[PDB]
Amino acid sequence: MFMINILSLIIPILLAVAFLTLVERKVLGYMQLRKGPNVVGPYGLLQPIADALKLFTKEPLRPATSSISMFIIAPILALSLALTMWVPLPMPYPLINMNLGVLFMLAMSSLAVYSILWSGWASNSKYALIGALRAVAQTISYEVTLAIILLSVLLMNGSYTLSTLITTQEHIWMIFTSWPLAMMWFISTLAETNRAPFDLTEGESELVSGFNVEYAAGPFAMFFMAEYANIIMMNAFTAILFLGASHDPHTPELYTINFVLKTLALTITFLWIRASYPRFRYDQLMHLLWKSFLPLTLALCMWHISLPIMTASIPPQS
Amino acid sequence: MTMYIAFILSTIFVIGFVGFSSKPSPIYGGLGLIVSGGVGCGIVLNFGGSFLGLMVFLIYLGGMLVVFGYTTAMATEMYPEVWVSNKTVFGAFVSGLMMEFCMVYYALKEEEVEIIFKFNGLGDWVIYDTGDSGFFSEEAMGIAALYSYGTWLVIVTGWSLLIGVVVIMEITRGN
Amino acid sequence: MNIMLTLLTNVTLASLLVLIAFWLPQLNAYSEKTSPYECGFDPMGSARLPFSMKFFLVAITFLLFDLEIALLLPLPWASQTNNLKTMLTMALFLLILLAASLAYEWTQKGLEWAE
Amino acid sequence: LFQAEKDRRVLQMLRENLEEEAIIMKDVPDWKVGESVFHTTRWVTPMMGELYGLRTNEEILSATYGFIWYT
Amino acid sequence: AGRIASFLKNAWAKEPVLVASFAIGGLAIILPSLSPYTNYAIRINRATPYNYPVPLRDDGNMPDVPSHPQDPQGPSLEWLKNL
Amino acid sequence: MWFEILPGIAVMAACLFIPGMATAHIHKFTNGGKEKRVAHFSYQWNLMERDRRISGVNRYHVTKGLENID
Amino acid sequence: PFFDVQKRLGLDLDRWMTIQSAEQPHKIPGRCHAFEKEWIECAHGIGGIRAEKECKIEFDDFVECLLRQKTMKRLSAIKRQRDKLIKEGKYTPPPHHLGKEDPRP
Amino acid sequence: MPLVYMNIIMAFAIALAGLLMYRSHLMSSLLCLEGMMLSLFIMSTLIILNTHFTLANMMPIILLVFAACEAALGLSLLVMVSNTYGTDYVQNLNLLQC
Amino acid sequence: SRGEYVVAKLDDLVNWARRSSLWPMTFGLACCAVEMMHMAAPRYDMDRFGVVFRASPRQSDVMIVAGTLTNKMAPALRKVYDQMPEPRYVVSMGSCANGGGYYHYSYSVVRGCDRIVPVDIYVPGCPPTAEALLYGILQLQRKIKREKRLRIWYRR
Ligand SMILES: CCCCCCCCCCCCCCCCC[C@@H](O)O[C@H](CO[C@H](O)CCCCCCCCCCCCCCC)COP(=O)(O)OCC[N+](C)(C)C
Ligand SMILES: CCCCCCCCCCCCCCCCC[C@@H](O)O[C@H](CO[C@H](O)CCCCCCCCCCCCCCC)COP(=O)(O)OCC[N+](C)(C)C
Ligand SMILES: CCCCCCCCCCCCCCCCC[C@@H](O)O[C@H](CO[C@H](O)CCCCCCCCCCCCCCC)COP(=O)(O)OCC[N+](C)(C)C
Ligand SMILES: CCCCCCCC/C=C\CCCCCCCC(=O)O[C@H](COC(=O)CCCCCCC/C=C/CCCCCCCC)COP(=O)(O)OCCN
Ligand SMILES: CCCCCCCC/C=C\CCCCCCCC(=O)O[C@H](COC(=O)CCCCCCC/C=C/CCCCCCCC)COP(=O)(O)OCCN
Ligand code: SF4
């Protein structure tokens, strides 16, 4: 019966990823004065299925100079971690209830960078190596700031339990208390998901395809699925963190609908951002994260430590 | 003997240690250390140390990433070595595995003393506490006591970290 | 136990996808097809040659800054102590020292990449 | 109330272990039944190998990892 | 008096992020020492009963110790419900 | 159309609905129809184990009321 | 060598963390609080040479609490005798040791 | 001692043997150093959790901090040596004799 | 027969999937690449047919040879064609790629890309209009619709 819950979490996520791609293409098209997929199925609704079927019936290539074990392992790790990050999210009840769910997401997101690193290095090609090193630089840029932002926001929650965030935001959204932290968190989530304007690891215009340039067919499909699942997961995490839906214990699907709508809004905002800005330079991304975000984040961490004591507003939990 | 979960995790811990101690290319050494870190996090979680295990896994993942970046720059070695690409590395790996297996066999069926004490097995579940009380986490309370009890520790740790920044910037200056 | 089952399920699903990807289609692998890609022309050197890191000092600093967040993470639990003044003083001291280290690295050109 | 019930439960489990020990080791050369391992005579909290030693693996697994593995 | 104003103007024109960070950090340092609610926060933390309150053996001359939880003696949390 | 993007968004919303409601319904089904008990601390675990012991069917969610006091 | 500035100034830089019977947060006790307390009160003020001989009983009890070697030996012997008695079949363990018990609250 | 304790101690011994037996790369030895630190962390955490020494729960975290200072130190040296030789091989460190 | 019906249905499904998701390599040589861009432009919007450019040859299905192929460049075209995983298709667009075109009698020009790679569709014009290239792509889709690999395997 827990296996059924696992499947009911895994299969819909993959379906949403598949259709996210269609949504992504259509939104970009209409923002570019065109239509996007509207032939393969009514309103392009069968286009993701055709893409999935085409990719998995195409020949997978194993490069001659590549390291076989890491080359095959990296996409498996990417997709498995992308699926695993969903289990502690309360919608409004988590599949897995952790005392420290936030730390769990932090650690697993930190371990998801190795799929790009091992993939790029094991491809044994120059563009893949450049993509992997760009991933190293990206993580060095965003990690500390993201962690300190998370700590500063959760100081008003009282714990690292994700469900408690629903109780914290029963009357007001946390974005009205920490909007300066919310903006930096949103930018850091763009940087963490390798999304425009921070898509340096792929860098199509600069690096052809980046870390996955040598991947074809099914493994490439899994890398794409992992990336889009990460998009949806991170936006759901942001919606839980800063826009708390009201929960009725006898009426939980109201919370589920509200949370899904907020997550879709944030994902559509991601797609909107991709269509509006030029790409950063990765040294410029590091300088942005270390010279602007880091000092403000440190100051706001001090402020959000002092404020609950200042006003006698410390949250309940130990 | 019950589900052998802790013993299996500890054995994988030792195997990862043997993997990165055989000293293949530092890419594979970093992979072995990452596996060991995750498995050690699991071991610590199985004893109630959620924060410590997650904390050490998060710290190690970040550390390994820097090591991978540094390996691609300064330890590249045009034909990087895997555990089966060289007789020395394979020999060290096999020796580590065999020594681990021999020690486990000697300590499992019988009760032999290797260096300090002996073991009969019995599973690690035996030495638990039976304590039934608390609306908090003892581990979390002990770690949070650092800011009230451990003022001296905070002072020395902060001074050491600041000095470490100064020290690395002095060492890498050159001239 | 449930988390272990979830991890096993995810890894099994990914591995099964890899197996179908590699065993369902028709493979025609020849030496020209599997050669490394460098935009149509052969690579000059190896991809296993050293690749300079221009952000090496920032990379080293990242280790100490990463341990600082590990130091700072028990603050939600630390805010429940009776000696609130001491805990606040130590938390602010830790953050001030982190900010001072960042300022020192910034002023001495430690954040500029090597050319 | 919880403390009273816990005390009775622990004492009953220890007593059942003692009664089974009296039967199992009837013909062991010089085994003194119910012998402590501590020189002191004060109460010592049991080790969970003393409470669930003679029981099935299911209840041992529960008493050891039920709270940790519960999610 | 006049140098600091020009320096602040130049900093606000050139590095507003640093000015904001320093202002917020300075406020975080100073304000807790001037607030009457810090004592209230300490008292609230002290009012949380994490462990069982072990009763005292009545020796006969402790007037301030209650004999029942509802007796008027002992600490009062009336200041908290009105806060 | 711009409203032609809506069918795909609707399919994504329908897919994202399923995990939360599936979890809620499975929790109700496997916990006596009254929400899954949360045990973050050992006191709650002790309460759950006591509930399982006094239930007589080895199920914590089977609740015994004031009908067990003769 | 050791310059006892903490004793001279009454500063207590690190002595709060030396023993497990010393003022834990929320009065949480160590697993072996009583044994360590007894050993410390036995060995206080008489010096290490005298304490190593005259407080050996308390220290042995404390070590038994810390590592439980004798307890594991006793349990192993009990289970070995039980296995021997059951393999040739004259024990028949009671139903409450097999899972057929009636639990109490 | 249970089997987990001697497994952690064996991991420490293996990592020490790996450090003491250099092959060519200094980075490999630094990885062995980090592995020794990790085994120490796991061992100390297991001992502290088993005995419910509450305050000592802050000890392993501190142990992590000075681990990083050792790694960041070592990496720094690995840079300088590299800048002298274009290689992190330990055979190049032979200007000084005994 | 049941097996023949099953292989025919699977054949139709695979053909539909392949023709409905055609990913050309981001690859242009000369003037014809401008009309290829105009085909990708909003007026024609090839993306609505499921036709998306991708830079990497490993993630591509179609090579549109759009422009003159010179002797100096022919090995690179052959190489990026060889690195395409199968099934792969080639469209020859314009006079220069089809047969040399204006530069047929040149010392440095390959007289048609079909001397280097096999070609599926030839799109005439100098340049072909974006509408003509779209017609060629839909003709390639129809040709993919006609192919029967599973039936041929079954009748073996
Ligand atoms: C969505 C995720 C979940 C999916 C759930 C299902 C999981 C499916 C498993 C994934 C693999 C899918 C592969 C589908 C095609 C099968 C490929 C292979 O198994 O068939 C042949 C296996 O046959 C071998 O040649 C040897 C056969 C016999 C020798 C060993 C097998 C012994 C088993 C005993 C059989 C006797 C009768 C048994 C009756 C039960 C190998 O042929 P090969 O050309 O290489 O590979 C290319 C396949 N092509 C042709 C379709 C492109
Ligand atoms: C005599 C020497 C003076 C000159 C030499 C300087 C060299 C030493 C460096 C600094 C000395 C300060 C260390 C003193 C030990 C602190 C512990 C003690 O003083 O009490 C603490 C008082 O600490 C307070 O926070 C104030 C002191 C903190 C000072 C801020 C940091 C300044 C250090 C800067 C020097 C270090 C190197 C340079 C770094 C920039 C906490 O007391 P309290 O919490 O009530 O009770 C705890 C017991 N409970 C838990 C059972 C209730
Ligand atoms: C439980 C699921 C397991 C497998 C999962 C895989 C997903 C299932 C497969 C999805 C099926 C959808 C494909 C059907 C789309 C056909 C659309 C139709 O329009 O195509 C027509 C022809 O359709 C095809 O000939 C047949 C399509 C399908 C044939 C058999 C499908 C059998 C699928 C059953 C599942 C098998 C999976 C086996 C593994 C378990 C002609 O269109 P076309 O000319 O192009 O477009 C011209 C554009 N115009 C009109 C504007 C000018
Ligand atoms: C009483 C005291 C209480 C506390 C006081 C708090 C007051 C705070 C006042 C200031 C808060 C501002 C917070 C903003 C933090 C970053 C701003 C910043 O300065 O960054 C910019 C740059 O930041 C960016 O612009 C990022 C670029 C990437 C843009 C990506 C998309 C744009 C964002 C879309 C909307 C985001 C919505 C976020 C909320 C979503 C819901 C969570 C610096 O870059 P430069 O211009 O180059 O200057 C430095 C060199 N001279
Ligand atoms: C009192 C509390 C302080 C502690 C809390 C602070 C919290 C965190 C903030 C500090 C983090 C570290 C900051 C690092 C310091 C930067 C030093 C530096 O080098 O800055 C220069 C710039 O020079 C400066 O330092 C900026 C101006 C001076 C600093 C900012 C203003 C100082 C404080 C102003 C606020 C004080 C209170 C507000 C007044 C309110 C009005 C009455 C960088 O310029 P470049 O990188 O070379 O530019 C290259 C491209 N052209
Ligand atoms: S065929 Fe005409 S338009 Fe096309 S590349 Fe050649 S000269 Fe240019």
Short mmCIF file of N, CA, C and O in Angstrom, two decimals, chain A residues 67 70 100 103-104 106-108 110-111 113-114 117-118 121 129 132-133 135-136 139-140 143 160 317-318, chain B residues 25 27-28 30-31 34 50-51 54-55 57-58 60-66 68-69 72 80 135-136 141:
data_model
loop_
_atom_site.label_atom_id
_atom_site.label_comp_id
_atom_site.label_asym_id
_atom_site.label_seq_id
_atom_site.Cartn_x
_atom_site.Cartn_y
_atom_site.Cartn_z
N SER A 67 34.38 6.87 -20.54
CA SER A 67 34.44 5.92 -19.43
C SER A 67 33.04 5.35 -19.23
O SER A 67 32.13 6.06 -18.81
N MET A 70 30.80 5.41 -15.49
CA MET A 70 30.28 6.72 -15.10
C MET A 70 29.33 7.27 -16.15
O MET A 70 28.32 7.90 -15.82
N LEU A 100 13.83 16.75 9.70
CA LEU A 100 14.63 17.70 8.94
C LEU A 100 14.45 17.38 7.47
O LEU A 100 15.27 16.68 6.87
N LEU A 103 16.84 20.03 5.31
CA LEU A 103 18.22 19.54 5.20
C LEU A 103 18.31 18.39 4.22
O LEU A 103 19.31 18.25 3.51
N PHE A 104 17.27 17.55 4.16
CA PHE A 104 17.26 16.45 3.21
C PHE A 104 17.27 16.97 1.77
O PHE A 104 18.05 16.49 0.94
N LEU A 106 18.35 19.92 0.82
CA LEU A 106 19.66 20.54 0.62
C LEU A 106 20.71 19.51 0.23
O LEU A 106 21.42 19.67 -0.76
N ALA A 107 20.80 18.42 1.00
CA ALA A 107 21.81 17.41 0.74
C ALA A 107 21.59 16.72 -0.60
O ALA A 107 22.55 16.49 -1.35
N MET A 108 20.34 16.39 -0.93
CA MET A 108 20.11 15.70 -2.19
C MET A 108 20.34 16.62 -3.39
O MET A 108 20.84 16.18 -4.43
N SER A 110 22.53 18.91 -3.41
CA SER A 110 23.97 19.04 -3.48
C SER A 110 24.59 17.82 -4.15
O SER A 110 25.66 17.91 -4.75
N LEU A 111 23.91 16.68 -4.05
CA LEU A 111 24.40 15.45 -4.65
C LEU A 111 23.96 15.28 -6.09
O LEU A 111 24.45 14.39 -6.79
N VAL A 113 24.47 17.47 -8.43
CA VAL A 113 25.43 18.16 -9.27
C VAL A 113 26.43 17.19 -9.89
O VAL A 113 26.99 17.45 -10.94
N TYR A 114 26.64 16.05 -9.23
CA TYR A 114 27.57 15.02 -9.69
C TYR A 114 27.15 14.30 -10.96
O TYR A 114 27.99 13.72 -11.64
N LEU A 117 28.62 16.49 -13.43
CA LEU A 117 30.06 16.39 -13.31
C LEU A 117 30.59 15.08 -13.86
O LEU A 117 31.54 15.06 -14.63
N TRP A 118 29.98 13.97 -13.45
CA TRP A 118 30.42 12.66 -13.92
C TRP A 118 30.06 12.48 -15.38
O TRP A 118 30.83 11.88 -16.13
N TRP A 121 32.65 14.66 -17.38
CA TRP A 121 34.00 14.11 -17.35
C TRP A 121 34.08 12.77 -18.07
O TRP A 121 35.07 12.49 -18.76
N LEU A 129 33.66 18.67 -20.88
CA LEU A 129 34.49 19.08 -19.75
C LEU A 129 34.25 20.54 -19.40
O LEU A 129 34.20 20.90 -18.21
N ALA A 132 31.08 20.69 -17.47
CA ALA A 132 31.24 20.20 -16.10
C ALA A 132 31.93 21.23 -15.21
O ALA A 132 31.52 21.44 -14.06
N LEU A 133 32.97 21.88 -15.72
CA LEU A 133 33.65 22.90 -14.93
C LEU A 133 32.76 24.10 -14.68
O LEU A 133 32.81 24.71 -13.60
N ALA A 135 29.58 23.82 -14.25
CA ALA A 135 28.72 23.36 -13.16
C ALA A 135 29.42 23.50 -11.81
O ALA A 135 28.79 23.89 -10.81
N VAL A 136 30.71 23.17 -11.75
CA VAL A 136 31.48 23.36 -10.52
C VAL A 136 31.42 24.82 -10.08
O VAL A 136 31.12 25.13 -8.92
N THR A 139 27.87 25.82 -8.71
CA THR A 139 27.60 25.38 -7.35
C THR A 139 28.37 26.22 -6.35
O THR A 139 27.82 26.66 -5.32
N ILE A 140 29.65 26.48 -6.64
CA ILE A 140 30.45 27.34 -5.76
C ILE A 140 29.80 28.71 -5.63
O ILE A 140 29.83 29.33 -4.56
N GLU A 143 25.80 27.99 -3.54
CA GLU A 143 25.46 27.08 -2.44
C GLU A 143 25.33 27.81 -1.10
O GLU A 143 24.33 27.64 -0.38
N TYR A 160 12.96 22.47 10.91
CA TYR A 160 13.21 22.12 9.53
C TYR A 160 12.15 21.18 8.97
O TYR A 160 12.33 20.62 7.88
N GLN A 317 8.56 25.32 18.39
CA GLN A 317 9.22 24.03 18.52
C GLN A 317 10.63 24.17 19.08
O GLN A 317 11.30 25.19 18.91
N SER A 318 11.07 23.11 19.76
CA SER A 318 12.34 23.08 20.48
C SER A 318 13.52 23.47 19.59
O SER A 318 14.62 23.70 20.09
N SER B 25 42.69 7.20 -9.91
CA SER B 25 42.51 8.61 -10.25
C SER B 25 41.66 9.30 -9.20
O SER B 25 40.68 8.73 -8.70
N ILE B 27 39.37 11.28 -9.35
CA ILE B 27 37.94 11.26 -9.69
C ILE B 27 37.27 10.08 -9.00
O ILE B 27 36.24 10.22 -8.33
N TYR B 28 37.86 8.89 -9.13
CA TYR B 28 37.27 7.70 -8.54
C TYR B 28 37.46 7.67 -7.03
O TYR B 28 36.62 7.13 -6.30
N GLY B 30 37.29 10.42 -5.22
CA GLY B 30 36.19 11.25 -4.79
C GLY B 30 34.86 10.52 -4.83
O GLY B 30 34.02 10.69 -3.94
N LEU B 31 34.65 9.70 -5.86
CA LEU B 31 33.44 8.88 -5.91
C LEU B 31 33.35 7.93 -4.72
O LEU B 31 32.29 7.79 -4.09
N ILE B 34 32.51 9.84 -1.62
CA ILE B 34 31.10 10.23 -1.61
C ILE B 34 30.22 9.05 -1.19
O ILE B 34 29.28 9.21 -0.40
N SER B 50 20.14 12.17 13.10
CA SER B 50 19.71 12.68 11.80
C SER B 50 20.51 13.91 11.40
O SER B 50 21.06 13.98 10.28
N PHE B 51 20.60 14.89 12.29
CA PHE B 51 21.28 16.14 11.96
C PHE B 51 22.75 15.91 11.66
O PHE B 51 23.28 16.44 10.67
N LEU B 54 23.18 14.01 8.19
CA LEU B 54 22.89 14.88 7.06
C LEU B 54 23.94 15.97 6.92
O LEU B 54 24.35 16.30 5.80
N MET B 55 24.37 16.51 8.05
CA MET B 55 25.36 17.57 8.10
C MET B 55 26.70 17.14 7.51
O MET B 55 27.30 17.87 6.73
N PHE B 57 27.16 14.68 5.44
CA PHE B 57 26.98 14.29 4.05
C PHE B 57 26.97 15.54 3.18
O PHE B 57 27.53 15.56 2.10
N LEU B 58 26.32 16.58 3.69
CA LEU B 58 26.24 17.85 2.99
C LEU B 58 27.60 18.51 2.91
O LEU B 58 27.93 19.16 1.92
N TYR B 60 30.57 16.96 3.05
CA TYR B 60 31.39 16.14 2.17
C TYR B 60 31.09 16.30 0.69
O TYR B 60 32.00 16.27 -0.13
N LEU B 61 29.82 16.45 0.36
CA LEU B 61 29.43 16.63 -1.03
C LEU B 61 30.03 17.92 -1.56
O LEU B 61 30.53 17.96 -2.68
N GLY B 62 29.97 18.98 -0.76
CA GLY B 62 30.54 20.25 -1.14
C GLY B 62 32.05 20.17 -1.27
O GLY B 62 32.63 20.72 -2.20
N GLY B 63 32.68 19.49 -0.33
CA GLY B 63 34.12 19.31 -0.32
C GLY B 63 34.62 18.51 -1.50
O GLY B 63 35.65 18.82 -2.09
N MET B 64 33.90 17.45 -1.83
CA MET B 64 34.25 16.60 -2.96
C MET B 64 34.15 17.34 -4.29
O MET B 64 34.93 17.10 -5.20
N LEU B 65 33.17 18.23 -4.39
CA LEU B 65 32.98 19.02 -5.60
C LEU B 65 34.21 19.87 -5.86
O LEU B 65 34.66 19.98 -7.00
N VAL B 66 34.75 20.48 -4.81
CA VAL B 66 35.96 21.29 -4.93
C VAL B 66 37.13 20.39 -5.33
O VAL B 66 37.96 20.77 -6.14
N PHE B 68 36.92 17.55 -7.02
CA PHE B 68 36.78 17.21 -8.44
C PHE B 68 37.28 18.35 -9.32
O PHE B 68 38.02 18.13 -10.29
N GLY B 69 36.88 19.58 -8.98
CA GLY B 69 37.35 20.72 -9.75
C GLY B 69 38.86 20.84 -9.73
O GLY B 69 39.49 21.13 -10.75
N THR B 72 40.55 18.01 -11.94
CA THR B 72 40.55 18.27 -13.37
C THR B 72 41.63 19.26 -13.78
O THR B 72 41.99 19.31 -14.96
N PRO B 80 43.79 8.27 -16.94
CA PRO B 80 43.44 8.10 -15.53
C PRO B 80 43.22 6.64 -15.18
O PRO B 80 42.77 5.84 -16.00
N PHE B 135 9.78 15.49 24.48
CA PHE B 135 9.11 16.18 23.39
C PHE B 135 10.11 16.93 22.52
O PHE B 135 9.72 17.83 21.77
N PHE B 136 11.39 16.58 22.62
CA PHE B 136 12.44 17.18 21.80
C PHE B 136 13.42 16.10 21.38
O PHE B 136 13.28 14.93 21.73
N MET B 141 19.19 19.18 20.87
CA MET B 141 19.43 20.00 22.06
C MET B 141 20.92 20.10 22.36
O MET B 141 21.42 21.19 22.67
#
